[PDB]
Design a protein around this ligand. Sequence first.
Ligand SMILES: NC(=O)c1ccc[n+]([C@@H]2O[C@H](COP(=O)([O-])OP(=O)(O)OC[C@H]3O[C@@H](n4cnc5c(N)ncnc54)[C@H](OP(=O)(O)O)[C@@H]3O)[C@@H](O)[C@H]2O)c1
Length: 159
Amino acid sequence: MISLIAALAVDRVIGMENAMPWNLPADLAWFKRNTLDKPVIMGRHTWESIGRPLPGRKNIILSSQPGTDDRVTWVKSVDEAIAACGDVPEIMVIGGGRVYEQFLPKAQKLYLTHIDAEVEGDTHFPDYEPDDWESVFSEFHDADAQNSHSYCFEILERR
Ligand SMILES: NC(=O)c1ccc[n+]([C@@H]2O[C@H](COP(=O)([O-])OP(=O)(O)OC[C@H]3O[C@@H](n4cnc5c(N)ncnc54)[C@H](OP(=O)(O)O)[C@@H]3O)[C@@H](O)[C@H]2O)c1
């Protein structure tokens, strides 16, 4: 199946100027945890921000244009992207905006990081219907020495 994985600040804010407007090492770990040994579909935008494959995962990028790193796989359509995954149990969609927007409808689950920070962004997470999903997990964390904001992990499934 298909899964989305994002970290949202206040107001679904997900990025600014091609970046994540905060720094939460703790999130990094949860992300790795959740994407380890899975294929990951990402947008060219996001790809450019990462700048190198994610070990432990099949990296599939979406671009109209042609590939620019032989180490990762390129694609020109949502169905091909999906194709490229193969017969895997969970495909992970890692953003950016436009991509979330697209796979959203197709998703059966989301993995969220709710971060208590109010920041301006140029990208926000697709609006979804609270009714359609069922929160099956939550895990609160207070700000800390390294994580300057408290945040909460959560997991929803399509109702
Ligand atoms: N907060 C988080 O959880 C999280 C996770 C990821 C990213 N982000 C943030 O996301 C922001 C950028 O997201 P974005 O929406 O600007 O870009 P994106 O989705 O990362 O990149 C979009 C690009 O992907 C290509 N694309 C998308 N759908 C396609 C399709 N069906 N076929 C072909 N190409 C397709 C297009 O590239 P072409 O130019 O090649 O057509 C498009 O310009 C950044 O700020 C990043 O930091 C946040």
